[PDB]
Amino acid sequence: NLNETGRVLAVGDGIARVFGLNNIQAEELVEFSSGVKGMALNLEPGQVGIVLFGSDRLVKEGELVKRTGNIVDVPVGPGLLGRVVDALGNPIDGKGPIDAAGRSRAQVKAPGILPRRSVHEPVQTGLKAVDALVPIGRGQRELIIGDRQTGKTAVALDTILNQKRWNNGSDESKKLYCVYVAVGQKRSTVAQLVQTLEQHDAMKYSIIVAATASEAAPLQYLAPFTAASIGEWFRDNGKHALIVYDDLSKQAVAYRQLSLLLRRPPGREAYPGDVFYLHSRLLERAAKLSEKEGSGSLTALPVIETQGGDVSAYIPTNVISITDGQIFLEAELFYKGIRPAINVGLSVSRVGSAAQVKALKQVAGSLKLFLAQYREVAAFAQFGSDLDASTKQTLVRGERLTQLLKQNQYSPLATEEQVPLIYAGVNGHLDGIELSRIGEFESSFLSYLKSNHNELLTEIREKGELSKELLASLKSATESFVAT
Amino acid sequence: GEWFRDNGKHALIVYDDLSKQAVAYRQLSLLLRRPPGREAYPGDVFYLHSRLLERAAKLSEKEGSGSLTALPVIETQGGDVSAYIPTNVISITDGQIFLEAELFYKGIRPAINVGLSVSRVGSAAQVK
Amino acid sequence: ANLNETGRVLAVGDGIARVFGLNNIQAEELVEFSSGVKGMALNLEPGQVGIVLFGSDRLVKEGELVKRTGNIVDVPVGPGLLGRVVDALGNPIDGKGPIDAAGRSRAQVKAPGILPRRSVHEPVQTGLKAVDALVPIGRGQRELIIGDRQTGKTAVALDTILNQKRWNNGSDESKKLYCVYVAVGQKRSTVAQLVQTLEQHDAMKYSIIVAATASEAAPLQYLAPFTAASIGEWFRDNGKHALIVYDDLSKQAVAYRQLSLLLRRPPGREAYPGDVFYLHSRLLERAAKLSEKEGSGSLTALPVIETQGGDVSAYIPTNVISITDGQIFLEAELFYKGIRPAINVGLSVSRVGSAAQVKALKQVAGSLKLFLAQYREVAAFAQSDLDASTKQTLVRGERLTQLLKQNQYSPLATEEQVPLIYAGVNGHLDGIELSRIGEFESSFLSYLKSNHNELLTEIREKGELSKELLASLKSATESFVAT
Amino acid sequence: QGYAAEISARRNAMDNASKNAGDMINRYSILYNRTRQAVITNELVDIITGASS
Amino acid sequence: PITGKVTAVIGAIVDVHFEQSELPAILNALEIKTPQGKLVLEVAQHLGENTVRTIAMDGTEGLVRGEKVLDTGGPISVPVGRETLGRIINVIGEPIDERGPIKSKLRKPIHADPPSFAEQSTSAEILETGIKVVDLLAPYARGGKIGLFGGAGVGKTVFIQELINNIAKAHGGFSVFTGVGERTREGNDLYREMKETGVINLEGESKVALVFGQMNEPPGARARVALTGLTIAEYFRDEEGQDVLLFIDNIFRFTQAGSEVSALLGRIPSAVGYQPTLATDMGLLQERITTTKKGSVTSVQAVYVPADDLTDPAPATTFAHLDATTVLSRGISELGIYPAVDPLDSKSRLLDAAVVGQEHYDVASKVQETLQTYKSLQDIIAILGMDELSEQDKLTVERARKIQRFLSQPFAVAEVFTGIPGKLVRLKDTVASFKAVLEGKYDNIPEHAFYMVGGIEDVVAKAEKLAA
Amino acid sequence: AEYFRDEEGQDVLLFIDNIFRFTQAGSEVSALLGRIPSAVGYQPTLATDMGLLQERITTTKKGSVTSVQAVYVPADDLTDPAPATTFAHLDATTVLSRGISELGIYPAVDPLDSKSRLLDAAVVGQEHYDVASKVQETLQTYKSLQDIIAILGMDELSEQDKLTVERARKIQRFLSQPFAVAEVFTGIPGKLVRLKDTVASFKAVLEGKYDNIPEHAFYMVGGIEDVVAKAEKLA
Ligand SMILES: Nc1ncnc2c1ncn2[C@@H]1O[C@H](COP(=O)(O)OP(=O)(O)OP(=O)(O)O)[C@@H](O)[C@H]1O
Ligand SMILES: Nc1ncnc2c1ncn2[C@@H]1O[C@H](COP(=O)(O)OP(=O)(O)OP(=O)(O)O)[C@@H](O)[C@H]1O
Ligand SMILES: [Mg+2]
Ligand SMILES: [Mg+2]
């Protein structure tokens, strides 16, 4: 009867209006006679509005529709590691079935006020600019934002690749299992990304949740939440997860599609009234849990694509408001040869120094000051006006620090290698080097330290802290190399 | 005020301020679902402030010689006088006393910007 | 029931009537109301029809009876319209009695496809030195004229219309070019004065005027270009050559925006509906040259666009630019310096190009486009000292620019354009005072017309300069400049 | 002599700079008007879309 | 067969009532017999009460409420296979070259699912176009997806025709060209040029199939012709197992056409009036154009940019779908620097040191650094002029101006209206020339010598002519 | 807070963050309920919702409810309807500025945009008012001169202008202060400066008694005593 079944009244543009289904729960998963599934978003006095997870060609008026009782849930567990799955956890890599430790609903309430703990562990990205100036802590919600083709995905992918060092180790507390959510991307791009991950052997600890462009709007909508549920298994079982949403703008566009086709009242820029709710309930699921809760964590790296650098837009403003920090990428810096083109002025991390490797904190403390001064000094000097000698020296320092932060794609640096470079730059030892040669200096300097001073690198890594003796030895080595 | 005006007495009315009256009228119009306009104000928002302000008048001797002076206050966000309501009120009134924050910070208080301030009735009203 | 061929008006407002009945009406069918005002069946719906009114809605009241015409919106076409001024629906408004029609053609028709067409290979000689030299227009081309108000757009189009006199008085239908001028949104007095201007120059006997003046209801302004194109298509389809000027398509776009918004269709960019592209494209695609199998007829279009603040990047301007085969950009910065017709030779492009140009002009006008762009480059940084080469460049540019100025309503034939451009390009003007270049032309042509009429006749008839004719023209130019 | 020449040259250079600044002001005034109209139109379209449902 | 009656005709939208117990599935093709022939409607929605809403593939004028509609029983289907080569196909799959029927053994529906994730294949092979700016700063990928972005009048058609001339004549594999809302004149020009060059051969073997829904067509036709072009290219990809070229000028018209009908379908307008379904319509059309393990498809898509606004939803949505992009700009065109490609907005995933090589990557990166440095200074250069710059800035601006002019190139297809003979420059020659320019070897050459020359040898020759 | 005020007679502090969230949630609920959106999407009832929230928070004759309200400013735009509506209800505004922070001058309050109802000579006394007014004049003159200094530097300015600019820079850096909470963002021990000492210090700096002190001695120090101590430590 109509209690557990219904009749399709209308079909169009991926929406079905269904009569009956009296006992259906809001957002319950529904199955049409033709086999395609849908999700009952609208409950109304005489209708159910169901958004289809497939082609509406299959559904046609008069078709019988069946409840399921299941609100949308997805498989979770370590068996997904190395797999590529759709928004509902079905494998699409073409390998065998997926073993799962359990099933978890898509929307789940974020960890409350009580169980959390203050973020203190670092997410070592291996990018000099990020680790030095905008540190990312485990449990932090760090926004990556910028225009098209500026380097956002490159930054996230370098962060993912850098975790090889610890994912190979025995210490389960240092590991970081990665989930990459491709929303609206074309399938060939995800194929190239998995090719990159397997080429660098980073796939054995990664998970890909793909809702590509051709996927019906509901799956592009629902992929971030199911990927969050997938990472929350690691979070809740005492393990550490990093989830990259690439990118939330296309999820917002998909929700605009759904809401407008359900004829819900639009908001600004025709987005639905509650996109902020959408992204806030997604991002608040990242947390660092207390010792009672097994000390697990989930770290989020949302990606946002601005149009013409306009952050005042609705969705960019919302996500900037939600997240704990921003890594602004800018095309003008990209074409000046700065790579990964991070705008170190606009970029901020609110956890900041509380979640930074202590040695890199010790050496990097002054870096922000020099760069902040350099920006204004360069703005003045670009006009060609006469210059004071000390101001000229601030130009000398700032240009070389800017050159020092350049970094080739897919080449992350261990902090044992980041510390000497930032030390040399900050303490002025680079002022005598030709600006063109800084990229050579780095490449040679590390090769020197790994040969003549390997003990320094070993101590910097294992201790994580520069004692006075280690700092003096680093000074000695830096001056020794600069002499030669 | 019109009681004083019509009975031959002189009155002064200060509206503090008309931007918030326009906001309240926008609330009424939108919740009544009357057709919006620029900046979501109702189409005839000009007819609000023109209906309100044209009641300021100086009456002839036959009509009792009374008067009603009006000093509508207007708040410009970021100094933008091109906004809809500032434009309407600037159009309706006989002049403006323009206050600028830059002068206020400099210590020039009451911070009247003399260049932008104009009284179109002007000298005729001034004390000889 | 009688509701099959008639209907009862349900409602009237915003220039739209809602009618009950008219069961057998065709979409876009023309219907007639009781008061004699006409409308077009835009929307057919279950139980009602939407009629766009080609007139003031005062003329229609609820409860009136409406009658089918049985015909999709169509206008009379034929040679009898030559010399006539007609409204958007082909009714005569000059007051000279009924129109004589060879037939009737729908306002809306699909432009001829890929196969029926031919590459443009014949010139539309505008009589303007700058246009005929630097941005030639061919028969079957669709060349945009674009620029600010009062920059001379209509002057260029009307000079092109007037120049056709010398051939329309001839015997060969292969040379005759019949001109349709479309006034959309223009002041009625302006159109009347334009008609008088044509009749003064005797250009009316081969021209047709279609007018939807500013006061006429928006649907008529929207419709007028389509019916004028249908009028020109008769000449196109019967092997004759026609020229149609749309002045302006921007005001047609404004009228279509009015219709769209009064139908409450969603506003798009700049509040225009998304359909506006399809408004112009299906119009401007009707300008074509047909193949030999189709009788080789052609229809040439010169759309006129008014750009606020000089924006060639605005929505409607870019739409039309993306539809036409070129553009003649008229620049205020030049017009108010007295540089008239004020062609911006840098942004003006004809992408049919040399295929349309007369070979004699293609010979003498060699690289003049490039030289004038180069002059506009070198002259920018001239105001670091000028090298003698830059001084020579500035002399050449100054003097060629002074030579490209032209008086309104003074078309200048190819046999007269060729000697002047030859003298300019080959440098014989370098030593002549530029303030006297306006004198130079008047004298030089006169000299040629008295001493060397044979050279002009050969330039006309051959359409080419042989080395003998080239050398004779060179000799005449040197003889004059020495004189 | 060099001082007199330098002062005159700086005068002329600042004159050229003022001309160029005026031209840029004209260009960006036109651009400002265009952006003002576009902003008003787009926000009004958003309001109308919100109202018409 | 299932039949019904027309009940509402609005614009390109026709509602049909099927009082039979069964209704046609969505995307089904319905046929109305008319004096012109037949009118094909495509089912877009089911409205209830046995009514469906459909998009007309041709003009709805002359339709009468009550016209009999017959269901064809399947989607719009088009001929496929080699019998389509050397011919012009209508949107609904009919010959319009007037050379009679198409005798293909098969006809396939224009709507099909995109290839799955497991079917994707990832090439990293450079396609040499012979164009300096593209070959240097944004190399094209063989088997990849290529896009041209540009407003009106910047010259997208000339660029597309130059690409066709340079590539399609030597690709070996079959080609498909889809005109989606472009000029009929230029489709005729393409057909004529192909006939003269033997790419189309009426007496024998032909290697290019033409599908045209040009801009004179109603929105219903423009919204679907791209899928016919795809459906042919997909048959060449998957069934014939060939490599394929797939040109689409202009794919933006596919999106725009949808918007034209969206308001009539009853949807709530999206931003700036676009249809809510923009992203998913784009996805369904677009990542169906892809290389797969069965065959290689190189696709070149011209994307119009309304009002030169690259932030418009359609171009912005299209950017994500492409491997290589070249962005023609009006600002570059006004300088006379054709092909007007913006060297700092053209982008390609193949500009990678592992793909182009370290030398080419270094040259391209330094070229972009020089151009960006020059662009940053244009405010100071505009107000204060060159004199107040530092000597290093003056040198960099000189090299930037020379590089700008050196990136210009004359195409053969433009010779008709430019009057400048066409030049083709090899990839190695381009890299060597720009490496030489950046090394300052030609600091003495006046910048004018670099304008519209095919390589550094022509720069030297033109400098010699300028000296005499 | 109201129960503590009206039923216990207490003086109450009501800390609120974030008021922008109240406005934004009102906008979301309004949009969901189908009300026609107002400018930039805010709800029609924005002003009256804010009024109903705010002017319940007031000092009645039973007790005083002090409130500190953190207001997020989207896109740093103080003209946005939410901050613009909030401003009208406040007695003291402490406008944090990104520009001041990028100079490194924390806590990065904008010395000019921040305003107080109580900065009146009848409330704080004429000496405090005079010092505050002179500080505002100095900082505003320095801001006005920056537009020229960005082109011609300080060399072209008159000696009076040079002196006032230098004192303005010293004052601008002297407004910085090390908070205790900031000891994770800084190693500097936090300090708390009395109002009287603040007035005395800024009067001393305005009068030029410390013209001989380098600018950096004023950065992130406490009172003027810390200025002297740090100046000696640098020397
Ligand atoms: N550090 C780097 N050094 C050199 N090239 C880089 C670097 N980071 C990114 N790139 C290049 O910049 C281009 C853009 O990179 P990427 O794909 O990560 O950008 P994105 O912002 O994610 O782009 P989109 O919006 O297209 O998804 C690619 O060519 C990438 O190779
Ligand atoms: N070749 C010319 N020589 C001299 N004056 C000219 C020339 N062309 C145009 N003018 C002047 O320009 C005036 C306006 O010309 P015209 O009517 O062609 O401009 P328009 O761009 O069509 O204007 P509108 O936008 O008002 O319709 C003419 O009255 C005449 O004064
Ligand atoms: Mg990316
Ligand atoms: Mg005119």
Numbering used by the authors:
A (entry chain C): 26 to 509
B (entry chain A): 256 to 383
C (entry chain B): 25 to 407, 410 to 509
D (entry chain G): 224 to 276
E (entry chain F): 8 to 475
F (entry chain D): 240 to 474
From the manuscript:
We purified S. cerevisiae ATP synthase with the detergent n-Dodecyl-β-D-Maltopyranoside (DDM), which results in a monomeric preparation of the enzyme, and determined its structure by cryoEM. Three-dimensional (3D) classification allowed particle images to be separated into six rotor positions, corresponding to the catalytic and binding dwells for each of the three main rotational states. For yeast ATP synthase imaged without ATP, the catalytic dwell structures show αβtight either in the open conformation lacking nucleotide or in a closed conformation with weak nucleotide density, and the binding dwell structures show αβtight only in an open conformation without nucleotide.
ATP synthases use a transmembrane electrochemical proton motive force (pmf) to generate adenosine triphosphate (ATP) from adenosine diphosphate (ADP) and inorganic phosphate (Pi). ATP synthases are macromolecular machines consisting of an ATP-hydrolysis-driven F1 motor and a proton-translocation-driven FO motor. The F1 and FO motors oppose each other’s action on a shared rotor subcomplex and are held stationary relative to each other by a peripheral stalk. In Saccharomyces cerevisiae, the FO region contains subunits a, e, f, g, i/j, k, 8, part of subunit b, and the c10-ring of the rotor, while the F1 region includes a trimer of catalytic subunit αβ pairs and subunits γ, δ, and ε from the rotor.
